Symmetry: D3
Subunit: 67 residues, 6 copies
């Protein structure tokens, strides 16, 4: 598919629409919550809604380690 190595499946538990951006919160395995801030245009075009099953995607070079 795509080079981004992090692909986490989950369900939408939160949605907040802005003017330029929008926030999507997904509940994944173990009950952890992933928060995404993307364009309002993409949220609308993809038809994001509470309860939908979507996948969070993250490029490897954007992941930090806390030790």
């Amino acid at each position: 598919s795509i080079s981004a190595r992090n692909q986490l499946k989950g369900k939408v538990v939160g949605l907040k629409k802005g003017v330029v951006t929008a926030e999507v919160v997904l509940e994944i395995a173990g009950g952890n919550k992933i928060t995404s801030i993307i364009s309002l245009d993409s949220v609308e075009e993809l038809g994001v809604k509470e309860g939908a099953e979507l996948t969070a995607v993250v490029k490897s070079t954007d992941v930090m380690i806390l030790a």
Copy 2:
């Protein structure tokens, strides 16, 4: 406490050291695997090693939605 909203606990299952960067692979809840590319310097100062328990951190503005 840091603003980055995504913080996922896991165990180190893969580690590869380059010249400038290094790759850390974490196994988190549900079997999901997180891949991180960071500086070699940080991997050495943090003492990252296979089997260690660490946390992956990702800023909300870097998470995309696939669906």
Copy 3:
């Protein structure tokens, strides 16, 4: 301790709250000003306020060189 190599201490001199995001401006050593755009949620959970002493954090792979 986090892998992100850039950690700069400063004082909050500007704060603007949007619908989804928020802007924090920090004055660091030498008079330099750091601008951060993060989630509104994090700005509220952290209790960020003008005059507060906080730290700006930036991952090494996000820093470019101009010259």
Copy 4:
């Protein structure tokens, strides 16, 4: 100039060349150190060298707050 709001002037105190990437460390005001990981091609083309006076640049959406 450019939209990236963070522009920090400094002097090169460290340089490490990889195969694909390279690390540049700059000393800025207050003695803080900024670490950048960019392409080896750009380090070579810009002629980066120990002691040179350059500027570190960071997009606002890549800056986190630690409180």
Copy 5:
């Protein structure tokens, strides 16, 4: 000269201002379109308007590959 390896000349065909951020859409050579989300402050300081001729800039480490 900046290290960011992707520099695409274009014309502004879309501009949407928010509270904290702003969206800029550029038409570039070959019939492609680029969408940028940056600070409202930078859009105003740069004098961005529909019809302006500007350049979109992306760091190499932020570009993914889809197959």
Copy 6:
């Protein structure tokens, strides 16, 4: 469908493998060139080779504006 708003079709004209990362250069429509730095693992898993027809993908929040 992914939320990333920038999707540019091209042909691979350059490939350089490192230890941890890898550099891919694509020629896109209109005579523009895109440079991507991703994981070596993804380059190998995707079967990236010179001459391949692939798509470069960038999140809107990573695109700056130069005037």
